[PDB]
Amino acid sequence: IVGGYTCGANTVPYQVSLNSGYHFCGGSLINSQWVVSAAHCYKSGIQVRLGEDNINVVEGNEQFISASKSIVHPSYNSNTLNNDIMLIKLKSAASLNSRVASISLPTSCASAGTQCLISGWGNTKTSYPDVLKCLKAPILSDSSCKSAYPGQITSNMFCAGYLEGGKDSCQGDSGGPVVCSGKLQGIVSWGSGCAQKNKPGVYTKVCNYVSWIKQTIASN
Ligand SMILES: [Ca+2]
Ligand code: NA
């Protein structure tokens, strides 16, 4: 997160760190047994770390739970990054409390200008901060999104952030949450680097995937 601020400890209780030796991506807890993240974050082995703030210090309120299943969207395209979404089933249910909580899936898509909260331990320009970073940022119109990335924005992508630059999610934030009005509307997906002028962050449009997410949870 560039141009952000340090989150209050555990103030983002749906935020998880994906770890395979070190932190490599974010995710969002959306069910006691399931985390949603980005398909481009895929690894065959993943430890989910919930209740984190300082990922480099054992504070005590963390829950470390290995991934038992990892399901990438069947129509995920690694070129266009269309359908950049992945579900992780936890080996055991996360225990929900004040510091570890589910975030609601969208009830509808979000209108342009809706204020969101983006968070992660990604780059802020060894590279990554210890402490979870936060950024407030608005949903941009589909127009501003498409203008910025001609021919590259599908119906499954939203831009969230600032055309001006200096405020954006970066590598390491990938797979992490964009939450607007209590609902997970975006998953950190891609961009042209980060925080550059007229290159706002591009995010998987979660409001298109509620039925696929529910189906996947129901089946597995
Ligand atoms: Ca910790
Ligand atoms: Na935290």
Side-chain angles (χ1 to χ4, degrees), residues 33-35 48 65-71 87-90 92 217 220:
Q33 292 184 280
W34 294 84
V35 162
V48 176
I65 309 170
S66 293
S68 82
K69 301 177 187 174
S70 177
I71 309 175
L87 287 161
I88 297 167
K89 186 180 192 183
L90 300 179
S92 66
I217 293 170
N220 299 273

Side-chain angles (χ1 to χ4, degrees), residues 180-215:
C180 325
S181 284
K183 300 194 297 311
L184 181 74
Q185 297 285 9
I187 299 166
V188 180
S189 181
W190 68 273
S192 187
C194 58
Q196 298 184 27
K197 185 179 189 295
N198 292 103
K199 294 295 184 167
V202 192
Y203 298 85
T204 305
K205 195 176 190 193
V206 182
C207 61
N208 293 356
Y209 295 93
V210 177
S211 279
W212 175 76
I213 289 165
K214 201 56 216 60
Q215 280 159 11

Side-chain angles (χ1 to χ4, degrees), residues 51-62 64 130:
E52 285 279 20
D53 188 48
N54 192 327
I55 49 174
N56 292 308
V57 166
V58 189
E59 178 269 344
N61 284 284
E62 306 97 335
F64 292 0
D130 307 322

Side-chain angles (χ1 to χ4, degrees), residues 37-77 79-90 92-124 127-146:
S37 189
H40 81 262
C41 288
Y42 176 80
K43 306 288 222 311
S44 69
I46 299 172
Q47 185 185 59
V48 176
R49 302 187 164 193
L50 309 102
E52 285 279 20
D53 188 48
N54 192 327
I55 49 174
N56 292 308
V57 166
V58 189
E59 178 269 344
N61 284 284
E62 306 97 335
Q63 306 179 30
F64 292 0
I65 309 170
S66 293
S68 82
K69 301 177 187 174
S70 177
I71 309 175
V72 298
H73 198 280
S75 296
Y76 169 61
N77 186 309
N79 192 319
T80 62
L81 286 187
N82 199 26
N83 305 294
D84 186 9
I85 186 171
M86 167 179 81
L87 287 161
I88 297 167
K89 186 180 192 183
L90 300 179
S92 66
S95 179
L96 312 173
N97 50 43
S98 61
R99 298 171 180 89
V100 173
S102 59
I103 176 74
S104 185
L105 295 176
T107 269
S108 77
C109 302
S111 66
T114 303
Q115 298 164 18
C116 310
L117 179 70
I118 312 171
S119 53
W121 290 270
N123 220 89
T124 51
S127 288
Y128 299 159
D130 307 322
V131 187
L132 184 63
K133 308 305 303 313
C134 278
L135 174 68
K136 281 166 184 172
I139 303 297
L140 301 177
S141 70
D142 178 54
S143 178
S144 301
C145 200
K146 288 186 173 151

